[PDB]
Design a binder for this molecule. Structure first.
Ligand SMILES: Nc1ncnc2c1ncn2[C@@H]1O[C@H](COP(=O)(O)OP(=O)(O)OP(=O)(O)O)[C@@H](O)[C@H]1O
Ligand SMILES: Nc1ncnc2c1ncn2[C@@H]1O[C@H](COP(=O)(O)OP(=O)(O)OP(=O)(O)O)[C@@H](O)[C@H]1O
Ligand SMILES: [Mg+2]
Ligand SMILES: [Mg+2]
Lengths: 172, 172
């Protein structure tokens, strides 16, 4: 049922760290399945969000379980499946891990100043520094004790992180 | 909550019509959001199918309702959203339509001989005739009364199918 020769990689990291760009390119070049985790939020969450209220860990819980389940499905028919999910808290990672031993994470790791300039570089985008601060505040970095976590250096042009991500995926 | 300025396109058609190959390349070229609808099956459907049994329409309902919420979520942040779902039965399509007035279908239309040839050209694939035959039996072509349906000619090279898809997407 779990297909141990198929693997799932959750692209994680704070907002602006490259999750969508990297994951978009990596799936293209690898012919891999690709799911953006934001699309699994229940109707409930989309409406809360539209109304400007910020989700809570109790709201994230149903979203994450659906993420879990979608990972379970993707691994039924693809050797390599990529999911985009910031996954800031260890506890979110545990919820994704459950029942998916063939799941691992690729942490797109960068420090604050690198990500900030990358967020600023978008024409017309009004940058609120506080948004990023909190991202980093919320971030619970996966340490070495989290052994299904691979880490990729973002202080690199898009092509590099894409390559490092590929290397990380192919490394076995 | 319905962003009436954003749109969702459900690429549909029988097995082998090209849904995946076309949606992939098209989302790539348009930088559109993309969801393979098979990834939204509830846990139980996956197991049921893991066990070798085919889904019945009761199984499909919650699958489709979840896909519906997924389209709902996608249109929140993407101007163009692609979803792959063969959606053969009118009923499945209504399930998708509900609460999504900004959703429409893109029918990858073509006949047996053409689809057959293509499935057969898969290297290593032992073509089983009955499969495709059942697909066509099950197909309830969207007639003119389904006004949210766009049609594309599959009897054209992939990249033309792509362009024709791109053309109907940009047509408005
Ligand atoms: N390594 C890179 N080098 C230069 N620019 C990059 C790199 N990676 C991503 N970018 C750009 O920086 C911005 C942030 O990337 P992206 O949208 O993928 O981040 P994200 O992690 O998905 O953010 P969010 O989680 O908020 O949706 C984008 O404009 C993207 O084009
Ligand atoms: N118009 C095209 N011209 C030639 N070959 C095509 C064309 N479109 C798709 N193909 C090829 O035909 C095969 C069927 O395509 P594809 O896997 O995208 O169909 P599908 O609708 O997603 O089928 P399924 O629902 O079974 O996954 C693929 O191998 C694809 O590479
Ligand atoms: Mg993103
Ligand atoms: Mg397909």
């Amino acid at each position: 049922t779990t297909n141990h020769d198929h693997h799932i990689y959750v692209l994680m990291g704070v907002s602006g760290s490259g999750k969508s760009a990297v994951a978009s390119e990596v799936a293209h070049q690898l012919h891999a399945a690709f799911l953006d985790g934001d699309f699994l939020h229940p109707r409930r969450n989309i409406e809360k969000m539209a109304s400007g209220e910020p989700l809570n860990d109790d709201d994230r819980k149903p979203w994450l379980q659906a993420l879990n389940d979608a990972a379970f499905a993707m691994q039924r028919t693809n050797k390599v499946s990529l999911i985009v999910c910031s996954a800031l808290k260890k506890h979110y990672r545990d919820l994704l891990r459950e029942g998916n031993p063939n799941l691992s994470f690729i942490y797109l790791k960068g420090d604050f100043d690198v990500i900030e300039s990358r967020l600023k570089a978008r024409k017309g985008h009004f940058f609120k520094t506080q948004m990023l601060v909190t991202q980093f505040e919320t971030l619970q970095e996966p340490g070495a004790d989290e052994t299904d976590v691979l880490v990729v250096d973002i202080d690199q042009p898009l092509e590099g992180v894409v390559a490092s991500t590929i290397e990380v995926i192919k490394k076995g």
